[PDB]
Design an enzyme around this catalytic site. Sequence first.
Site, mmCIF file in Angstrom:
data_model
loop_
_atom_site.group_PDB
_atom_site.id
_atom_site.type_symbol
_atom_site.label_atom_id
_atom_site.label_comp_id
_atom_site.label_asym_id
_atom_site.label_seq_id
_atom_site.Cartn_x
_atom_site.Cartn_y
_atom_site.Cartn_z
ATOM 1 N N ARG B 44 0.790 -1.224 0.000
ATOM 2 C CA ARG B 44 0.000 0.000 0.000
ATOM 3 C C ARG B 44 0.812 1.259 0.000
ATOM 4 N NH1 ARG B 44 -1.378 3.250 4.450
ATOM 5 N NH2 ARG B 44 -3.098 4.711 4.031
ATOM 6 N N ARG B 87 -2.405 -3.261 -11.762
ATOM 7 C CA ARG B 87 -3.121 -2.043 -11.328
ATOM 8 C C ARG B 87 -2.744 -1.001 -12.379
ATOM 9 N NH1 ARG B 87 -2.551 -0.541 -5.085
ATOM 10 N NH2 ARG B 87 -4.143 0.900 -5.915
ATOM 11 N N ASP B 233 -1.980 13.196 -0.928
ATOM 12 C CA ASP B 233 -1.927 12.333 -2.097
ATOM 13 C C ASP B 233 -1.485 13.178 -3.276
ATOM 14 O OD1 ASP B 233 -3.173 9.838 -3.786
ATOM 15 O OD2 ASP B 233 -3.110 9.485 -1.568
#
Lengths: 340, 340
Positions: B44, B87, B233
Amino acid sequence: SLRSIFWDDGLKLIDQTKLPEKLEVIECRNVEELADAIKKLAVRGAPALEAAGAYGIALAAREREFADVDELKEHLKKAADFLASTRPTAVNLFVGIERALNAALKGESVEEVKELALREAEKLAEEDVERNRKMGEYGAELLEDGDVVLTYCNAGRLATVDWGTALGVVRSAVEQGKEIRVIACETRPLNQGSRLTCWELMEDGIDVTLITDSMVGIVMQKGMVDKVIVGADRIVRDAVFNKIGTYTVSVVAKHHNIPFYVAAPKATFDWERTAKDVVIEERPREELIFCGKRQIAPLNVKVYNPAFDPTPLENVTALITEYGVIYPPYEVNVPKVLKF
Amino acid sequence: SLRSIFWDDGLKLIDQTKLPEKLEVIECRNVEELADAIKKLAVRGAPALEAAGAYGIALAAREREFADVDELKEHLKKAADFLASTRPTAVNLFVGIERALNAALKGESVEEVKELALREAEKLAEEDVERNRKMGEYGAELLEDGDVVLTYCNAGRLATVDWGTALGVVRSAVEQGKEIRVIACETRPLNQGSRLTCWELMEDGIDVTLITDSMVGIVMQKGMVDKVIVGADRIVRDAVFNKIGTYTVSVVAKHHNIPFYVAAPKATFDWERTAKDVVIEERPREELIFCGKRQIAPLNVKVYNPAFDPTPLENVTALITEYGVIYPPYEVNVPKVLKF
């Protein structure tokens, strides 16, 4: 729809612990059953608990048959004592118990005592419904067609006998033909918002969108909210105590100039006190450690889990009561409107 | 404590899906096992994914034997394409893959290619750790002995290769001998706060108390918080995008005059954009409808589940980066400190 608790050949309650997956009506045929229903939060909300206290006495007097009145009466005092002990601090539960007992004891025969108990309990439940509808009509005047209302916790018909306080204001406006939509905060850590509020609104055909409590910021930031309406657990001279998180919502709304309303009846006011007199209880730490049976935190993590928070009245645009809408300055208008 | 992903005679990574119940390290013997890990979210965070992609190439080079350098090189290209496809929107994964592949391709023999592949993965992983330690050291100067730091989501050692960004500042201050305690918001709806932040701080001996996101209000009302430090982010010219709920914390902290700091490396800044250029994606509605396998909302309820929210830079006291602390005005100081 059904009232959250009522009498129909015995004490009936909507089993809220079964929501939102199933609507289940349970029957309390004895003192102990009601008491555990109260403990499990199958019944909740001040008015609901008041009605529970009163129906409790009507129930206790019907539990089994009685040939002699004085024996019946003695039993009622015991049942009243037992039910109130479920939580000595529940003012509403106490009020329901004592009002029903006081009335029943006025009977001079077994039938009289039985009828009087039930009659007082039914009157108290009916008065709660009338209070919420009146409060609703006053509050509906603050809502306009097309309004989107953000709410918190569950100040609706499950928390009262019927109609609700904050959601009762939404129901009254919808009844007037105003299109109203609701944004409901899930309300951690017990999720009353997602479990109960979303259920009763969808059940009644009122548009509702579910968001996390933390999303209150982005929704106001995006202009998705026209007004906020929440209920109250207790209103003192400088603050509104309600389910934890309410204060946070009030801060975001204040910054965004979004009207923030608190809907609560006169009986929720405790005007002799100020916030400093109130102690906020901590709820079980496991409510933050497990969700369902999924462990969401380390088992031994330290938890701070206050049950409520105080919202300063400076962040409340107006109070919506069954006596009318009350505006600042509250020190002047609360006594005036509530006729202290 | 263990790095979140690292190399010790083979690729190893903490299986985050198992936290907080237990610590389990996954050993990836081949590329498919790494892909499975990435897919189930055992890995993660942007820096950890960039390292995973680079280690992926070092792994592909060791996966089976190659008698020919050209066969090994073609194999690394196939592995690079497959890993990126696990991903496809994960930009950082793609980056680690491309840098590892580019460096490995410089080898002129099987041995050299393998060597260079691991060297580059180890270099990128190391650069993240270094970046976080420097950031932590600059940031620690903002904290003093006895500070209670409120955080949000998980900007720690799990979300990076090691040390962390926001929690890295806390680690750097503690290493300085300052007593630092943390208050962590559970961070709905995926609970990164309770599952990960509480886990890593407890694992490392740092005091941490868990609260719901909505309790940011009362906790500040009562002065339990001295400073707030969150990660990011993406930082654009007029806002910090971070886990949804971050903006709400910034509103409450601002009202209470509590310093609100954002710790993030230079790579997280996207200075040629403004908030209006960023689209916030919706996350799966089921995240608000179920907890574990317990239903917490009606199955068909309408849900609004944004992944992030934007915190205006006016609500950020200072940005903590590996180049130093940056203060308003950001239009001036961000390009200057980050060496644009």
